[PDB]
Amino acid sequence: AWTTTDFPAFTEEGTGRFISQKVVEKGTRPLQLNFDQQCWQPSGGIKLNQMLSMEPCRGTPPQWRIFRQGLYTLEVDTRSGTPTMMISLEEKQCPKWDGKPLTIDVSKTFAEGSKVRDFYSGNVATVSGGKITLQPAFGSNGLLLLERAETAAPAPFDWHNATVYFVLTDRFVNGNPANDNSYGRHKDGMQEIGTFHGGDLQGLTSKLDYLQQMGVNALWISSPLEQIHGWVGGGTKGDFPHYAYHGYYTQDWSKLDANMGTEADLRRLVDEAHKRGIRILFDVVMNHAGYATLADMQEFQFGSLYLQGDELKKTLGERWTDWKPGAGQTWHSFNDYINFSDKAGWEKWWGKKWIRIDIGDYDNPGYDDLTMSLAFLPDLKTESKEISGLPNFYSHKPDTAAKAIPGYTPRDYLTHWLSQWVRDYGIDGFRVDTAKHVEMDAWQQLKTQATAALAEWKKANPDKALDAAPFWMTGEAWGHGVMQSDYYRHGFDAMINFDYQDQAAKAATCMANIDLTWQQMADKLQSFNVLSYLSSHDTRLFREGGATAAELLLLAPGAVQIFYGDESSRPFGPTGSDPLQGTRSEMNWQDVNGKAARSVTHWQKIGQFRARHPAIGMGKQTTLSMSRGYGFVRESGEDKVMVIWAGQQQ
Ligand SMILES: C[C@H]1O[C@H](O[C@H]2[C@H](O)[C@@H](O)[C@@H](O[C@H]3[C@H](O)[C@@H](O)[C@@H](O)O[C@@H]3CO)O[C@@H]2CO)[C@H](O)[C@@H](O)[C@@H]1N[C@H]1C=C(CO)[C@@H](O)[C@H](O)[C@H]1O
Ligand SMILES: C[C@H]1O[C@H](O[C@H]2[C@H](O)[C@@H](O)[C@@H](O[C@H]3[C@H](O)[C@@H](O)[C@H](O)O[C@@H]3CO)O[C@@H]2CO)[C@H](O)[C@@H](O)[C@@H]1N[C@H]1C=C(CO)[C@@H](O)[C@H](O)[C@H]1O
Ligand SMILES: C[C@H]1O[C@H](O[C@H]2[C@H](O)[C@@H](O)[C@@H](O[C@H]3[C@H](O)[C@@H](O)[C@H](O)O[C@@H]3CO)O[C@@H]2CO)[C@H](O)[C@@H](O)[C@@H]1N[C@H]1C=C(CO)[C@@H](O)[C@H](O)[C@H]1O
Ligand SMILES: C[C@H]1O[C@H](O[C@H]2[C@H](O)[C@@H](O)[C@@H](O)O[C@@H]2CO)[C@H](O)[C@@H](O)[C@@H]1N[C@H]1C=C(CO)[C@@H](O)[C@H](O)[C@H]1O
Numbered sequence: 001a002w003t004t005t006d007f008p009a010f011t012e013e014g015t016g017r018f019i020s021q022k023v024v025e026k027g028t029r030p031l032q033l034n035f036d037q038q039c040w041q042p043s044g045g046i047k048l049n050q051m052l053s054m055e056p057c058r059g060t061p062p063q064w065r066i067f068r069q070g071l072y073t074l075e076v077d078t079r080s081g082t083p084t085m086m087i088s089l090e091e092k093q094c095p096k097w098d099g100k101p102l103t104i105d106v107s108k109t110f111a112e113g114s115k116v117r118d119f120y121s122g123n124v125a126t127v128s129g130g131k132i133t134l135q136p137a138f139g140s141n142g143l144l145l146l147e148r149a150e151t152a153a154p155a156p157f158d159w160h161n162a163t164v165y166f167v168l169t170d171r172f173v174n175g176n177p178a179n180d181n182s183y184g185r186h187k188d189g190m191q192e193i194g195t196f197h198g199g200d201l202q203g204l205t206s207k208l209d210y211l212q213q214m215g216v217n218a219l220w221i222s223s224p225l226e227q228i229h230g231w232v233g234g235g236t237k238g239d240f241p242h243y244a245y246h247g248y249y250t251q252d253w254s255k256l257d258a259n260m261g262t263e264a265d266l267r268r269l270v271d272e273a274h275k276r277g278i279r280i281l282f283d284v285v286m287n288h289a290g291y292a293t294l295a296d297m298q299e300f301q302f303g304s305l306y307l308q309g310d311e312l313k314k315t316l317g318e319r320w321t322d323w324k325p326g327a328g329q330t331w332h333s334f335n336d337y338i339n340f341s342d343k344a345g346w347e348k349w350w351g352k353k354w355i356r357i358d359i360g361d362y363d364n365p366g367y368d369d370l371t372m373s374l375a376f377l378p379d380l381k382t383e384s385k386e387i388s389g390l391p392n393f394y395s396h397k398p399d400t401a402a403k404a405i406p407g408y409t410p411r412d413y414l415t416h417w418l419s420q421w422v423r424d425y426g427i428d429g430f431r432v433d434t435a436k437h438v439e440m441d442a443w444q445q446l447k448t449q450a451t452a453a454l455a456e457w458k459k460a461n462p463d464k465a466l467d468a469a470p471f472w473m474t475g476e477a478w479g480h481g482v483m484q485s486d487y488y489r490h491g492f493d494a495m496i497n498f499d500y501q502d503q504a505a506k507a508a509t510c511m512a513n514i515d516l517t518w519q520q521m522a523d524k525l526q527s528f529n530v531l532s533y534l535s536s537h538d539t540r541l542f543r544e545g546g547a548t549a550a551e552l553l554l555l556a557p558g559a560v561q562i563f564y565g566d567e568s569s570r571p572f573g574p575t576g577s578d579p580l581q582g583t584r585s586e587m588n589w590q591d592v593n594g595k596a597a598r599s600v601t602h603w604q605k606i607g608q609f610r611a612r613h614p615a616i617g618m619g620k621q622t623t624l625s626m627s628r629g630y631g632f633v634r635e636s637g638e639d640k641v642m643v644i645w646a647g648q649q650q
């Protein structure tokens, strides 16, 4: 085994990685690693959170300086042939743990003489006098994930035990750089806060094995449908150009956005996801279309400018979208050139039958959630019973798959266009944006049509259909909690739960603090399902949990949502004058393969445990009473688990 002075013998934590943990005092010490008769020492400078190259031991061992007192993790990586190592620090009433084995009373859960596995370590104990003795493994944070040893593979998929991975496709993996600048889109050459970074469906497809190993069984992607081609001013200060990289500014529901890739790319993503038992969720919008942009105005011949003729080409250029702020201007300054009052010019856009907006001759937005122009976005007239025809500007968009359908309202078109993707690709469900800004009847129509569409795809593709499960729909209704609201009787199988974030925050430094929240949720969600999260694109990134974020999310009752990079502590990125933008930072793949490697392994083990046990997502909870540490049992049908947390090691 791998060993160094003062540290316990190293144990495997992910294939080819071995770790040891020990509370170290301030000071300096020599650092060598021994394996059999081999001696290795850091060849370069010894630093924290960095891949340290190593040499066969020679002369005096290098000095490892301990700047702060705390729990240190040493890691050795033997995958690249020659050993490299990683040093990291965890600094700083809560149950306390002396670091020694736990004797657990399992008499009420696991049968006398039966074998019980701690899934995290793989250690197996035989129940004797209703008790087992187990040492929580290095990296477990003092967790025992106790299951019947006969447990061997994932349980059947259930939405009420789902592990959803929410990915902003643009910010994940760039599979093909060729499509990064579709429709003449530009990088900003600054911090790329609001630009298309170039992540695409091909790139996402390449990481399906990565997601499968994490116990992900539902992949929620940012809308891949054709966005506004151009940009608007970013944040409150216009400090960056804001493009539709997040998929929430849709222009054509009938077409894929060229940045995301081809129909063949979507087909492969969905088919390869299904092969790995991963369901696909589209993020969808019916509330609004994207803002007017110079790109779209020029391309599709709509809107009015205060500029005319060649002074137009003087100020904005040959392509208006190529405009950049001059001295004393911001990225909002382009609005000064646009005549939003002009009725005739702006009717050429969506048209009066389609949207409410405070532009030209359009129906005025209302002063309520359903008919307001949210963040000045054109509000689609979902409640309208008027036969609309196509949006006016589609007359200048010959690549559209949209066709005029006799008797169709805007709502009929929207539900038809979204349902088309379900029918053609077998999309398993939707996450619905801006749920509280569209009338309930519109969401029911979408669900009914989407349900019929999936049933039709599964019938036509019996070789590809994983099961005969109905279409699934979740929604974001701002501030929704753990309640079976009227959304659940208008097409929604689960609503996104805003309240879990703050409860997890209160347990960030002591996992046991979550107990009441878990008891309440286990009890309430016997009758219905919610989708809970630590991190999202419109709140913040949960990074206060230290190394405990995995268990805080994945051991929650109900469906849970991993925001891409939760598993690798993806840092809050450049944000400018929009405080949400930093949540959409680039996926940190360099960290995944380096300083966050053991974090990914930790997330994989807890995620895989969840996938084996519907008792986690669906089970009634009994919180145990023990003299040492914290523990609960959950039970769903024949499935029964015990989670023990030893407590704080410091
Ligand atoms: C996505 C597409 O981007 C590029 O072409 C687009 C231009 O950037 C736009 O400005 C616009 O140009 C058209 C003018 O508006 C129009 O007045 C007329 O002059 O024709 C222009 C050229 O069509 O629209 C363009 C097309 O969207 C880029 O040059 C092009 O390669 C890109 N097309 C990809 C998309 C698909 C669809 O799956 C593939 O078939 C292509 O091979 C891709 O390259
Ligand atoms: C002030 C306003 O606050 C909350 O609004 C939420 C939206 O419900 C939520 O969808 C989200 O909006 C973003 C949207 O999701 C995204 O697609 C788009 O690109 O950007 C939007 C950013 O705004 O976030 C906002 C909060 O920032 C409440 O849900 C709203 O009810 C609330 N509205 C107020 C204001 C009025 C007008 O007088 C009343 O009609 C309304 O009853 C009141 O609640
Ligand atoms: C560890 C690795 O991290 C980053 O590479 C990422 C890419 O950023 C990301 O776009 C994606 O690209 C791969 C794609 O998934 C796949 O379909 C295609 O066939 O190959 C693409 C390129 O690998 O995923 C990778 C990996 O997550 C950085 O950009 C890389 O610099 C970085 N490379 C490592 C790799 C090794 C090999 O063990 C080290 O020895 C080396 O020092 C370091 O460069
Ligand atoms: C802004 C302007 O764009 C288009 O005009 C272009 C011509 O089509 C080209 O042949 C060449 O002359 O360059 C022109 C500018 O690029 C479009 O055809 C026009 O309709 C459009 N005018 C808008 C402006 C208005 C007022 O500001 C409205 O009166 C009018 O309806 C808008 O379409």
Ligand SMILES: [Ca+2]
Pocket: 174, 175, 176, 177, 178, 179, 180, 198, 199, 200, 259
């Ligand atoms: Ca790309």
Ligand SMILES: [Ca+2]
Pocket: 287, 369, 370, 371, 372, 379, 380, 437, 438
């Ligand atoms: Ca609305």
